[PDB]
């Protein structure tokens, strides 16, 4: 059921909470009936991940468990996959795989040549240099390098070893992307983080081709600091100026 993105539905406000900037997500490999929510407020100087027991508890309570990571993250580009959080260690291009339910670092590895420290942030800033994400095919990193002139680089990653399995060099400047997400092996890039937001560029990893496109999506609360696709519920999770929102998508 994989296909090209053709539409993004109007976003639902799941929660109003937190600072202007952050991330929230569910695990796409969590089993039926498990919709724990993982929540990270801020883009620097925070090592605590909130765990809400379910999407209902997230929407209707302020009850959560607080998980202490071994290091603070940078940015809002974390992802949860098969029970681990993958995140960018502060002030580095290191990725950490941390197994949430055993409080164990399972792997650390540098992401070769990636910029960090607000070098190749998305346009919103916030130390968003390295964005990790999951689609139907597995785990990916979206970043940039000096050898690719600050243009977005995509790598498919091994979720256990953190080694790069394949890399694609796009020609789109990462600092000009508001955010980005991958659906079915295609990178979709937004035009900005404020005002009238749209997906306006797509890079297809299956063919190493790109195009400019125009798929609007509602910036509901004025500023978007996190936007990722989840293949389990086929939705975009966003952090929109202190609100946690969710968009359905339409694929061809
Ligand atoms: C909050 O969650 C904890 C852990 O699941 C639980 O022990 C506690 O009863 C919850 N609080 C309420 C008011 O339900
Ligand atoms: C998820 O982790 C379990 C072990 O906890 C493993 O058996 C399974 O293969 C993993 N799934 C994927 C898709 O990697
Ligand atoms: C990406 O670009 C870098 C810098 O030019 C180059 O070293 C590398 O081989 C490229 N990788 C691919 C898969 O094109
Ligand atoms: C997505 O669509 C389904 C129905 O197909 C609906 O149950 C769900 O609430 C929708 N989610 C959002 C965020 O609109
Ligand atoms: Ca993203
Ligand atoms: Na991410």
Numbering used by the authors: 226 to 477
Would you copy out the relevant sentences from the publication that reported this structure?
Based on our previous structure, we designed truncations that are expected to result in a monomeric domain by truncating the dimerizing coiled coil and excluding Cys221 from the construct (the Olfm1Olf construct includes UNIPROT residues 226–478). We determined a high-resolution crystal structure of Endo-H-deglycosylated Olfm1Olf, which leaves a single acetylglucosamine (GlcNAc) attached to glycosylated asparagines. Our best crystal diffracted to 1.25 Å resolution, representing the highest resolution crystal structure of an Olfactomedin domain to date. Because of the high resolution of our Olfm1Olf diffraction data to 1.25 Å, we can unambiguously assign a Na+ and a Ca2+ ion bound in the central cavity of the β-propeller. Metal ion assignment was based on previous binding data, coordination distances and fit to the electron density. The Ca2+ ion is coordinated by the negatively-charged carboxyl groups of the side chains of Asp356, Asp453 and Glu404, as well as by the backbone carbonyl groups of Ala405 and Leu452 and a single water molecule. The Na+ ion is also coordinated by the carboxylic acid groups of the side chains of both Asp356 and Asp453, as well as by the backbone carbonyl group of Leu357 and a different water molecule than the one coordinating the calcium ion. The conserved residue Tyr347 stabilises the switch loop by forming a hydrogen bond between the Tyr347 hydroxyl group and the Asp356 carboxyl group (distance 2.7 Å) that plays a central role in coordinating both the bound sodium and calcium ions. The high-resolution crystal structure of Olfm1Olf reveals a hydrophilic tunnel filled with water molecules running from the surface of the Olf domain to the metal ion binding sites. In Olfm1, the tunnel starts at the solvent-exposed top face between propeller blade 2 and 3 and runs between these two blades towards the metal ion binding sites. Twelve ordered water molecules are well resolved in this tunnel due to the high resolution of our electron density map, including the two water molecules involved in coordinating the Na+ and Ca2+ ions.
